[PDB]
Amino acid sequence: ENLSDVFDIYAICACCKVAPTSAGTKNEPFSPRTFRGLGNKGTLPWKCNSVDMKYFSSVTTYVDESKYEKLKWKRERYLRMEASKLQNVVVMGRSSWESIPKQYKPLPNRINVVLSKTLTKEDVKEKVFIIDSIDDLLLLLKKLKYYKCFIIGGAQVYRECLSRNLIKQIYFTRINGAYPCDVFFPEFDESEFRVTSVSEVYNSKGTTLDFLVYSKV
Numbered sequence: 001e002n003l004s005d006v007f008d009i010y011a012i013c014a015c016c017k018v019a020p021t022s023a024g025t026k027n028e029p030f031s032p033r034t035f036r037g038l039g040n041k042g043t044l045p046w047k048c049n050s051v052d053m054k055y056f057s058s059v060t061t062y063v064d065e066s067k068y069e070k071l072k073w074k075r076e077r078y079l080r081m082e083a084s085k086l087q088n089v090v091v092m093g094r095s096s097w098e099s100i101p102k103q104y105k106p107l108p109n110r111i112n113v114v115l116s117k118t119l120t121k122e123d124v125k126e127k128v129f130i131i132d133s134i135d136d137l138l139l140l141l142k143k144l145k146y147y148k149c150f151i152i153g154g155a156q157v158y159r160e161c162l163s164r165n166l167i168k169q170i171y172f173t174r175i176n177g178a179y180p181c182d183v184f185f186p187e188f189d190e191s192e193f194r195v196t197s198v199s200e201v202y203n204s205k206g207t208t209l210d211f212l213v214y215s216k217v
């Protein structure tokens, strides 16, 4: 079956409009995807957005002890048929991991997993899991008790995961504001996904935003 579903590999990200420039063949003033701004100069285009911050925090930390049991079976089941506290898992590439003020790493109540090949335990003192590659990621999950695995960045981790059909659902936030960006959310065959949750329009500091949730067909 689908690994993505078996291990509930959901992806969450936040994008904003892209502030143009007056130079470069990279300018896409008419890109069909209005919200593709992911990062810039190693950080978030926008300013710490309180709301999304809260949203992201909420969603990635929420766990339902009961509903878990079902998932417990699903995985076990697959595990065997293949062989023939309770927190969520967060996963991020080195970049985004560094892009975080140490004072917030690792992320609380969440099993942190950093994807990288240039990091070692001697280097990372935080209590996190250092993964070699998506494959290991899978191997890791297989033997790990958690609610749902989350992919919180960055652009490469998304792409890779998407290209391998490892994303069950995507929690896509949208920040209505243009900001200079050098990193953008990767493309994919959206055909397999259908929006399942469209939140209302929220407001903060004067910048609008909303939350979407696309699911695999």
Ligand SMILES: NC(=O)C1=CN([C@@H]2O[C@H](COP(=O)(O)OP(=O)(O)OC[C@H]3O[C@@H](n4cnc5c(N)ncnc54)[C@H](OP(=O)(O)O)[C@@H]3O)[C@@H](O)[C@H]2O)C=CC1
Pocket (backbone or CB within 6 Å): 012, 013, 014, 015, 037, 038, 039, 040, 041, 042, 043, 044, 092, 093, 094, 095, 096, 097, 099, 115, 116, 117, 118, 119, 131, 132, 133, 134, 152, 153, 154, 155, 156, 157, 160, 183
């Ligand atoms: N708006 C949003 O929701 C988000 C924005 N961001 C922003 O994006 C930018 C960072 O994203 P991006 O540049 O794509 O970087 P990433 O955070 O994805 O980090 C890239 C690094 O991750 C590693 N990596 C990726 N895939 C693999 C793999 N399969 N196996 C092993 N290592 C892997 C590599 O580590 P190594 O070099 O050690 O091999 C790599 O150089 C930042 O500015 C950050 O602020 C990040 C997340 C979310």
Ligand SMILES: CCc1nc(N)nc(N)c1-c1ccccc1
Pocket (backbone or CB within 6 Å): 012, 013, 014, 052, 053, 054, 056, 057, 092, 096, 097, 099, 100, 151, 152, 153, 173
């Ligand atoms: C709150 C910012 C945020 N919001 C959403 N919706 N998704 C994310 N993946 C992140 C994020 C950004 C950089 C590093 C870790 C997580």
